[PDB]
Structures are given as C-alpha cells and as structure tokens.
Design a protein around this ligand. Structure first.
Ligand code: 4WI
Ligand code: 4WI
Lengths: 305, 305
C-alpha cells in the first residue's frame, strides 16, 4: 500500500547525458548511438537570444566549434544539422550505453519523468504532467536546458521532452526530440505567457481510484450521474470535458475496484460542489490531477523494467 | 525556479539490484562487490513468518539453496551469514557496476530516495523522510522487500534503508544495511503499531525558505520570536522542539534570503495559530515537512553527481 508521486528509474537516461559547449554557452545533450541532440540556443550568445536568427548563427559554426563531453571524454563532432529547435551533432563514437529508445510526442494530460541535469551530470528525477496549456510544473535552474522527459516501457525509453525555457509563475516549456515546441512558444528571450490551464479530469478520477485502493473511501456517495450531466456541472470548475476515450482508459481501475466510472464521477461532482469539509484524500487537501490511469495501475500493481 | 519533490538519479543503485529466491520465497537483494545483502525473511515460509526462529531456519540452509539472479545470470553463492535482520550471501562474482558506497544510519527528520523493486528489477523512485516515529510514508507491494533507500554525494552512494514490512495506515518499516531496524519493530508477522508521529519543524522552516526563494512571500510577517517562545507555542501543534543544531543547519538558507531563522519562526508561529486563510504555499494547502535544509539548497542551487 501507499501512494507516492513516483518517477521512472533514471539509469537508462543517465548513461545518455553529455555536456555541450559552443563558445561561451554550455548546456546538456542526449547522446544516442552516434548523435547528440541538444537545444539549438547553445549556438547563441546571451545577446543573440533576445532575437536570434538560428539559421544565420549556424552557418558560421563548424563541427569543431561544438565541445561535447561524456564525463572527462571529449567526443569528436563530425557533422551538425538543425531540426526545428534542436541541434543534431554527429559524433565519431556510438554511445555504448544507448538503451532501446523511441521519440514520441506526448498528449496534454500525460505524465513523464524528468532527469534534471547540469553540465552533463544528472542532479535529480521527478514526475511531471504535460498541462493542457502545454507547460510543465518543473524545477529547473540556469544550465538545465537539454534535460529530457521520458517514460520507460519494459526495456524501451520513450523520450518525449527536452527542456528549453522558463515562463512566468515558474512554469516550463520545451520541445519533443524532433525540436517541435509543445504549445505556442518560441526559443527567444522575449516575454511570452502560458495562458489559461485546465484541470485534467480523467487524472483526478484516476487518483480517486488510487485513494479507494489505499482505503480512503469517505468521498464515495450512493449516487450515479450521466456523462452529460457530469460534464455540464464540472465545466464551471475549469475541468476539461471527460470523453468516452477517458472513460475507456479508466476501465481497468473501475473493473479492479467495482466502482463504475460514472459512480466515481458522481462522487467527484459532490467534491467540486461541496469541497472536502476539512478532510484529506491520500494526505492532500486539494484534488490531484498529475497521476494518469496508467500511473495508478503501475504503482498499485508494481510494474518493473 | 520551481520546487518539486525530487529523488536522486537511481542509475548507480539500479546496477546493484538482484533477485534472491530461497525455496518458495523471492525478494530483492543489493549486490556490492562479491556480497548480496537481503532481508533475512527470504528463508521463511509464510507460516514461518508468523513466529520465526531465523537462527534455526538458517542452520538448515546451504549456499546452493539461495538462487541469486542478476537479470538472466545466476550468481553462484559461496558463503552466507546473518547480521541482525539481513542475510549476506558471498557470491563468486564481484558486481562490476559497484559504485563507491557507504552504509549509514540516518537520523529521524532526514530524507532519502527509495528505488522500489520487484523480482530484482527497478520499478520507480521516490523521496521519503525517516519520520520521528521511525517509519516512512512509502509505496510498496508484495515482493518489494530488499528495495533500498539512499543518498548520493558526488560519486558516493550512502545506503541507509532496506525495506522489510508494512504497518497500519500504509506506513513502512525497515533496517539499515547492518540489519538493525529503525524504531521498535521486529521482522515477525504479528500486529505492531508505529505510535505517535511528530512534525519535523526544521524541515517545515526549510520549505518556507524554498517558498520565499520561489516568490511565495504572503506568510512573512514583521515580527521576530525567541527560540524559547517559539518552542513553547509550537509544542501544542505536535511540532518537535527546534534545537540550536537545527537553527545552525538553516544558516545557509537564512544567509541566502536575508531572513533570520527566528523571523521565519515568527511567521511559522502565525501560520500554526491562524491557519493559511484559504491560501497555498508552493501549491500546497498544508505545511510540508519532508524537505531537509540540504534538499532545499541542492534543488534551489542545482547540485549534480
Ligand atoms: C536553459 N539552460 C535555460 C533554462 C531556464 C533558466 C531558468 N530556468 C529555466 O528553466 N533556458 C533559458 O535561459 C531560455 C533561453 C533564453 C531565455 N530563456 C528563458 O528561459 C527565459 N524565459 C523566457 O525568455 C520566456 F519567458 F520566454 F520563457 C528566462 C527569463 C531566462 C527564464 C532562451 C533562448 C529562450
Ligand atoms: C516484503 N516483500 C514485504 C513488503 C510488504 C508487503 C505489503 N507491503 C509491504 O511493504 N514484507 C512483508 O510481507 C512482511 C514480512 C512478514 C509480514 N510482513 C508484513 O509487512 C506484514 N506486516 C506486519 O507483519 C506488521 F504489521 F508487523 F508490520 C503485512 C501484514 C504482510 C503487511 C514479515 C516477515 C514481517
């Protein structure tokens, strides 16, 4: 028993992190086979970042201008190209620690582990949700760019995020590993705003299932609802619409607990209308939306890698 | 910016986890050089666990009765002994992935990363505090025993916890790597109770410093207090006494923010007496006590390994 925010074990990603330096600018890169992937703003001076022309900056760079270090070892750069907002540095050495991997673009509402890194060295691991406004609530300082987000499925690392920048209210924005931003953000040092987030309804329901599995059952009521009536009532509390796809992915938790999804929706409706009356759910005084249905099943049935 | 519950990168510990099976019973072991350390209840049938005589069970075991697997590879057991509540299995192969390591006994109020494991395979990593009642709020299922807790200091893994059991209200108990329990618990399947926990005052103060560093400052008042008056007022809220040792370890955060420790204590006194008046601190509606002063500094200044 017990329910904790849990990250994937980071080892498979730790063996892929390198340091990339171009002139004055240093950040992290991800070394897979004989390619290093890193944020393209490595080629920028702090002045260039205010209004960069990356194509123009990159013409005036050579292979040798990129210093790539795997611990103490320099990796020789033998080619370079830009794909959207990421640089690809071909190196003369394949990373012997390359795991089986895929690049995936995650959907809003889905979670991943972040391995926060500085100077090519891992510092910490935590779990994030891709918010509906295409930001993450991370923890990143100067030098963190090129830190990656990932999921692990048995032996296979699905890389989904590379860190680029911090917005107002300390939230974070970045790209997939093809260099395409999540959300309407650009890699330019100019004021940008996230704009309005929403509560991930399916994840709140997943976490209420987690709570029941752990013996927290006070919020279960005797009622059901229609999907229609639930979505009508929940809209005013800035909850995203619950779709039949969402109901389908809750099926395993519904089946395991013998609580129909629309019965749990009736309990959620009462929490939204009445509040928690000074009670906690899994130790929290607020409804939690950063656990997916898969996150609940994996932890409350012990999947390994 | 941003402040997240963050675990140490797990790779150095992932390369030490093996599966140990004795007859019918399987759990995890930690392979360092040519020794495997695991909970001694691996030698028990479920019936033996009700009232075990471990010394008697172990006499009737041979080296070959211990099946140790590192992924697919069986490690030959060439010797065995019991130290308190852990078994030590000497194997014929030194673990080539053994990190620099130490065994440490952690103090109540200190944190560590847990690598939850099943069948010798890592599943997840999370952060725990050793509670003042010598339990941890973990997430552990059947087969999790032998999962370890640790801290990483540059290259050096300090192992501090090995998992043995689950108590009432889903809290967890275990040993140091010399097999000595934290708290008054025994490895016997009979009802045992944790008894009353306390709030780790120095960690609540560390987290209020984290909040200020992140721009959450509404709770800062114009007052100071004496250590004496603070401890008198806080006692009724089941906060542990704040000692001069605790004030000393807050010094770096105090120095960094320019907020004296007793000024923050005056702010904490007002939160305890008045509540949060419907406000949050770093997104929480409750005061958080599972971040050490070191945890705040490391995250809010980016230490790597
Ligand atoms: C990469 N190492 C950093 C990561 C930042 C630093 C503080 N916390 C983080 O997550 N990335 C940057 O410094 C990027 C980089 C120029 C400016 N920048 C920003 O993150 C800035 N934010 C923005 O410009 C904004 F608002 F648009 F998001 C900053 C004010 C420094 C936080 C580039 C090329 C975008
Ligand atoms: C090791 N793999 C498990 C870990 C447990 C299983 C459920 N969650 C956990 O953390 N350890 C055990 O099963 C130990 C083991 C016998 C019984 N046991 C317990 O954890 C039990 N608890 C207690 O006996 C109590 F209350 F004293 F802590 C159980 C009821 C199964 C949770 C031994 C030898 C103690």
């Amino acid at each position: 028993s017990g329910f904790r925010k849990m990250a994937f074990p980071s080892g498979k990603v730790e063996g892929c992190m390198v340091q990339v330096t171009c002139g004055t600018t240093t950040l992290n890169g991800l070394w897979l086979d004989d390619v290093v992937y890193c944020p393209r703003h490595v080629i920028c001076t702090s002045e260039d970042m205010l209004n960069p022309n990356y194509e123009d900056l990159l013409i005036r760079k050579s292979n040798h201008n990129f210093l790539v270090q795997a611990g103490n070892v320099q990796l020789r750069v033998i080619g370079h190209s830009m794909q959207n907002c990421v640089l690809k540095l071909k190196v003369d050495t394949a990373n012997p620690k390359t795991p089986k991997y895929k690049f995936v673009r995650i959907q809003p509402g889905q979670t991943f582990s972040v391995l926060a890194c500085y100077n090519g060295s891992p510092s910490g691991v935590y779990q994030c949700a891709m918010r509906p406004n295409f930001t993450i609530k991370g923890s990143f300082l100067n030098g963190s760019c090129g830190s990656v987000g990932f999921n692990i499925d048995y032996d296979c690392v699905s890389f989904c995020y590379m860190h680029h920048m911090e917005l107002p209210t300390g939230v974070h924005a970045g790209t997939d590993l093809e260099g395409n931003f999540y959300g309407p953000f650009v890699d330019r040092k100019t004021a940008q705003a996230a704009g309005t987030d929403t509560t991930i309804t399916v994840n709140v329901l997943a976490w209420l299932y987690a709570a029941v599995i752990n013996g927290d059952r006070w919020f279960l009521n005797r009622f059901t609802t229609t999907l229609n009536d639930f979505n009508l009532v929940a809209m005013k509390y800035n909850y995203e619409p619950l779709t039949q796809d969402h109901v389908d992915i809750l099926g395993p938790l519904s089946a395991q607990t013998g609580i129909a999804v629309l019965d749990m929706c009736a309990s959620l409706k009462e929490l939204l209308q009445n509040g928690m009356n000074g009670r906690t759910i899994l130790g929290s005084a607020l409804l939690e939306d950063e656990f997916t249905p898969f996150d609940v099943v994996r932890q409350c049935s012990g999947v390994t890698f």
